[PDB]
Each structure stands twice: as C-alpha cells, then as structure tokens.
Amino acid sequence: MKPEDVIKEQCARAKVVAELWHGFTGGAPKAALENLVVEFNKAQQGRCVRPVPQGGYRDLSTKIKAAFAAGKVPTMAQAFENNIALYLEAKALLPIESLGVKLQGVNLTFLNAVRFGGVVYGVPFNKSIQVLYYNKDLLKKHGVPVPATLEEFVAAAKKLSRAEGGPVYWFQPDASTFAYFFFNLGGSYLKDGKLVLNSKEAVEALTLLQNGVKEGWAKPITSGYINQNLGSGPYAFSVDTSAGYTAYLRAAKFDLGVATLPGRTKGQPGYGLVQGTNLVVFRQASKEEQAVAKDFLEFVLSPRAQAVFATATGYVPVTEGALKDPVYQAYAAENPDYATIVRQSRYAKFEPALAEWEQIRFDILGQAIKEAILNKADPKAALDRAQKLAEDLLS
Ligand SMILES: Nc1nc2c(ncn2[C@@H]2O[C@H](COP(=O)(O)O[C@H]3[C@@H](O)[C@H](n4ccc(=O)[nH]c4=O)O[C@@H]3CO)[C@H]3CC(O)(O)C[C@H]32)c(=O)[nH]1
Ligand SMILES: O=[P-]([O-])[O-]
C-alpha cells in the first residue's frame, strides 16, 4: 500500500478534494509530501488534498500555463517567487492572509520573498539552501581542512585533484551553481533596476568554473544529479541544494560531510542560493476548496509537519516553531548536518523575482554557462550573448 494509493483512496471517499500541483518526481521530497498529505487527509472529515505530480518544476510551470489557457486551475500549486510574479500579472492568486492563515513565525528570509506590493501571495513550504557537500574520508586522507573561503576552496580542489588524479570539485553547469560563485564574488543581478547577466563578477564566476575544468580540479556533471554520479572518480566537494541531503546520504559510499559554504573571508559563510517552492492558492478555487487550502496551509506551517518534512529531506524548516519541535530536536541531536543546513540558511540570496526569470535562468543564462563550460565559449562572449537575449526578452 503506497502513500499515493492511500491518498487516492482518501480522495475517492472525500466530499471535497483540493488539488495541489507539484514538481516532485520522486525520492525523499515526493515521499515526504505524500506522507504529510496522508496525515492531513486522515484528520479531515471527507475534506482532502490530492497532490498531482506534474513532472519537474519546469513541467509544472508549463502545466499551469496550459491550465490558464484552458480556464481550469488547481486549488494550490508549488511556485517559485518569479512564478508568483507571473501569476500576479493575471491577478490569479488569493492573498494568503485573506484565508486567515497566520504567518507570524515564518522565517523573514522566506516571508519577504512571497510578499508582492506588501501582500503575501505564497506560503513557504519546501525551501532549500545550497550547502557544501564533501567527502570527509578524502579530506582526512590528504590532511585538507574543510575550506572556509573561496581561496581555500580552490586551493583544496587543486591539491586533492593532483593527489587523486581526477577533478574532485563536481558541479552541474547551471544557473544554480553559477549563482553560488557569482554572489560570493560580489555579484548582483540588478543594477539600477536593470537585469545584468554580463557584469565583471558574472564573467569572473564563469571564468573560475571554466578554468577549474581546464586545470583539472572541476568536473562538469551533465547526466543526472551529482549524488547519482558518485562512485565514478574521486569526489571531494559539491555545492548543491540541501533538498538533496538524504539522496547524498543514501548514495555516498564514503563518510559524507556537510559544511557551510566557503565565503570571501572567514568572517562569514558564503551566501547560498535559496531554491524550492512556496504554495499558492488560485482565486478560481471554490469557497469549499479554498477552506481545504486554508487548513492544509496551517498544517504545512505546523511545527511537527515542518520537522518531519525537513528531517526527511534536507529542506530548511520555514518556521521558528519547527526548530523547537521535539522530533526536529531528536534528528538534530543525532545528526549535526541539520543544524549545518539551518546555519547556512542564515546566509541566503535569491535570484530575481522577474516574471520572465524562469525562461532567462534556463534558456538564456543556463545556455551561456553550458556554452562556456561544455563548448569552451569565451565566458564574456557567452554572457554578452545572454545579456542581449535577456534585454530583447524584457524590452
Ligand atoms: N522551474 C524553476 N526551477 C527553478 C527556479 N529556480 C531554481 N530552480 C530549480 O530548483 C531546483 C532546486 O530545487 P530544490 O527544491 O532545492 O531541489 C529539488 C531537486 O533539485 C532536489 N533533488 C532531487 C533528487 C536528487 O537526487 N537530488 C536532488 O538534489 O530535490 C528537489 C525536488 O526535486 C534546481 C535544479 C535545476 O533544475 O537546475 C534548477 C533549479 C525557477 O525559477 N523555476
Ligand atoms: O579537452 P578536450 O575535451 O577539448
């Protein structure tokens, strides 16, 4: 009896079913969402949430695009901030506080991100931060401390790659990985209100990655997640979402480490990219569906729900109350990596919340990074093309 089979049975016997479209394809995130929903549905008297997998997050935004074109939206969906900005152009979203969901206690890093013209339009649900994953055994073998600075990180990657005869810093050539280097080299995506993809810091960040590939210390990962590639060649480090935590733990044959990100100096950890999603509630939903959404959103924000979901996955608990929940405290007491994730979540930056950002980050910025890393494009030339395409899209 799979959780999704139990949910099907729950919704079949329910009088009111609120659909929740999501972008979890599998692993711990999907299981954890389905377990949270089974528990919620059990407590409700014939009022249920039906999670509907729409593929990954890009497939989900496409599926919601189609739903608007069709005139039939779900009750709830996952949404990045840029997705929220786009759904707001259509006035498609209910203000959350209008349902009477209380938001006091939600981390301001996350709550600020779903506030548009002073009004909250999403509930932070599955919010991730980048962390430094590392191979404790390989660092101990070679006497290499966990790097605290970008300088130490590069030095460590070079020393270990030479010692092991393979590039030990593994990365996906994507917008998310680029953001870590860009932000910690002093980069900002907006200058005087304008999106800029081709700033000196952007070029420096993309040049550092390309040089690491050329110099034999940085390993591009082009097929699957990093954790799905472990076992093939020496691995020391990656910068990756905390939502992958339990996938790394399951895959690693070595003693997995999690550290805060390397920063410019030891005075502060590096900034990590916030990813994962918020839940939104569509205006088109019936009063009865909207009341299910209200109850489900209070449940998602409850310390126990947050504690079980964050500890199952690596997501950052979105409320102060979650950290005080005994189930959270029990996991943290046995495993210091959960506290590491929360400490890193204090040093957190977001990409721009432009409605067009999904398209820019994958089709324009992501493509420029792939051109430079995989096809040896000149970093400034690749990012100048990106800038021109983004300027053209945003005009
Ligand atoms: N559509 C759209 N996507 C966006 C936007 N900003 C960022 N992202 C994507 O968020 C993913 C991070 O979201 P996060 O919830 O932290 O992590 C995901 C999965 O990454 C992660 N996962 C799953 C299996 C596994 O073996 N390892 C693992 O790490 O678990 C979660 C659920 O699938 C990145 C991935 C990306 O596709 O390169 C592009 C990124 C945006 O604006 N729009
Ligand atoms: O180094 P070769 O892949 O161009």
| Residue appearing with tokens 């299981």 | 31
C-alpha 5, offset from chain centre: 27
Ligand 2 center–CA 174 separation, angstroms: 20
CB 40 within 8 A of CB 10: no
**Structure token digits, residue 50:** 């039906």
Ligand 1 center–CA 275 separation, angstroms: 7
Q: Which atom of ligand 1 is nearest to the CA of 351?
A: 6
In the chain, alpha helices (H):
3-12, 27-43, 57-70, 81-89, 108-111, 136-142, 150-164, 175-184, 200-215, 245-251, 287-300, 303-313, 320-323, 326-334, 337-345, 357-359, 367-375, 379-394
Ligand 2 center–CA 372 separation, angstroms: 12
CA nearest neighbour of 276 among 355, 329, 350, 225 = 350
Give the list of residues 6+ apart from residue 37 with CB closer than 8 angstroms, or none. 3, 7, 20, 49, 51
Structural domain spans, the chain: 3-126+276-344, 129-273+350-394
CA nearest neighbour of 2 among 40, 47, 25, 35 = 35
Ligand 2 center–CA 154 separation, angstroms: 21
Q: DSSP secondary-structure letter at 361?
A: I
Decide the pairing of beta strands 123-135 and 16-22: unpaired
What whole-number distance in Å separates Cα of residue 270 and Cα of residue 266? 9
Within 13 Å, how many C-alpha atoms sit on residue 241's CB side? 22
**Structure token digits, residue 365:** 């910025």
| Residue appearing with tokens 């839940």 | 279
Q: Whose CA is nearest to atom 25 of ligand 1?
A: 244
What whole-number distance in Å separates Cα of residue 244 and Cα of residue 133? 10
| Closest-approaching ligand to the CA atom of 374 | 2
Decide the pairing of beta strands 115-116 and 119-120: antiparallel
C-alpha distance from residue 40 to each of 3, 206, 212 (Å): 12, 45, 47
Ligand 2 center–CA 218 separation, angstroms: 14
Right CATH for 3-126+276-344 from 1.20.58.2240, 3.40.190.10, 3.40.1280.10, 2.60.40.1840: 3.40.190.10
Within 6 Å (CB) of ligand 1, which residues are found? 24, 27, 29, 57-58, 61, 80, 82, 126, 128, 174, 176, 225, 227-228, 241, 243-244, 247, 275-276, 357-358, 361
What whole-number distance in Å separates Cα of residue 248 and Cα of residue 237? 12
Q: Which atom of ligand 1 is nearest to the CA of 240?
A: 29
C-alpha distance from residue 30 to each of 26, 52, 156, 192, 243 (Å): 5, 11, 35, 40, 11
Q: Which atom of ligand 1 is nearest to the CA of 126?
A: 15
Question: What class does CATH assign to 129-273+350-394?
Answer: alpha beta
Q: Whose CA is nearest to atom 8 of ligand 1?
A: 275
Q: Which atom of ligand 1 is nearest to the CA of 29?
A: 32
What whole-number distance in Å separates Cα of residue 4 and Cα of residue 14? 15
Identical topology for domains 3-126+276-344 and 129-273+350-394: yes
What whole-number distance in Å separates Cα of residue 40 and Cα of residue 26? 20
**Structure token digits, residue 111:** 């709550």
Q: Whose CA is nearest to atom 42 of ligand 1?
A: 358
Ligand 1 center–CA 368 separation, angstroms: 19
What whole-number distance in Å separates Cα of residue 154 and Cα of residue 164? 15
**Structure token digits, residue 117:** 């013209």
One-letter amino acid for residue 243 of the chain: A
Q: Which atom of ligand 1 is nearest to the CA of 228?
A: 26
Coil, strand or helix at 208: helix
CB atoms within 10 A of CB 194: 11
CB atoms within 10 A of CB 333: 11
Q: DSSP secondary-structure letter at 272?
A: E
What whole-number distance in Å separates Cα of residue 38 and Cα of residue 297? 14
H or E, element range at 258: strand 256-259
C-alpha distance from residue 323 to each of 33, 206, 211, 261, 331 (Å): 19, 37, 41, 21, 11
